[PDB]
Amino acid sequence: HMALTEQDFQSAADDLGVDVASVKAVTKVESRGSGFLLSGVPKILFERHWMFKLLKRKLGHDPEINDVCNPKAGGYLGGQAEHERLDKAVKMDRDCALQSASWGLFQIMGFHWEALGYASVQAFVNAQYASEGSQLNTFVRFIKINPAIHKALKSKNWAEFAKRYNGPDYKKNNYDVKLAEAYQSFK
């Protein structure tokens, strides 16, 4: 499958108005490294508590509870088996299921499709299948629609970036220091 090129990094850097070293640093620290499984489908993690929340909102009442639709988070099988979980959830409701997986290099939740400017959940999904460059573009859009994160990236304020991107427990995995060290390694 089409993996990340120097041009993918340069295009992303240009679109975000940051240096290439910043994009490589955030990719090294925040990505899954590869955006695709051996089978050629995008890497996903299926989030059954998002499936429960989104299908509840759609139906106006609680859906059936099972291993892929449950207010209790977890129950991961990992790797290719997450596609089997997605398939079971699609057979409950396709749009809720696709929105309840995290996709590609940066593990972006499908429920962000509309905010990210995709025409539909399906267009978001097609962008995950297209290439690693397309998945990096999903990440670019995510930064653009989050100006405070965008500004932290531009200013190389790794702690502010990690607090907003990784959340309040970012320091548990030292995300700020990993970003700073990665940046120095590429600069």
Numbering used by the authors: 0 to 186
Could you pull the original sentences from the published paper?
The structure of Pae87 shows that it is a one-domain protein with the typical α/β lysozyme fold.
Tyr128 probably establishes a CH–π interaction with the l-Ala methyl group. In the crystal packing, the peptidoglycan fragment contacts a neighbouring protein molecule; this may be the reason why the ligand-bound form crystallized in different conditions and in a different crystal form that diffracted X-rays to higher resolution. From these results, the existence of a cell-wall-binding site within the catalytic domain can be proposed.
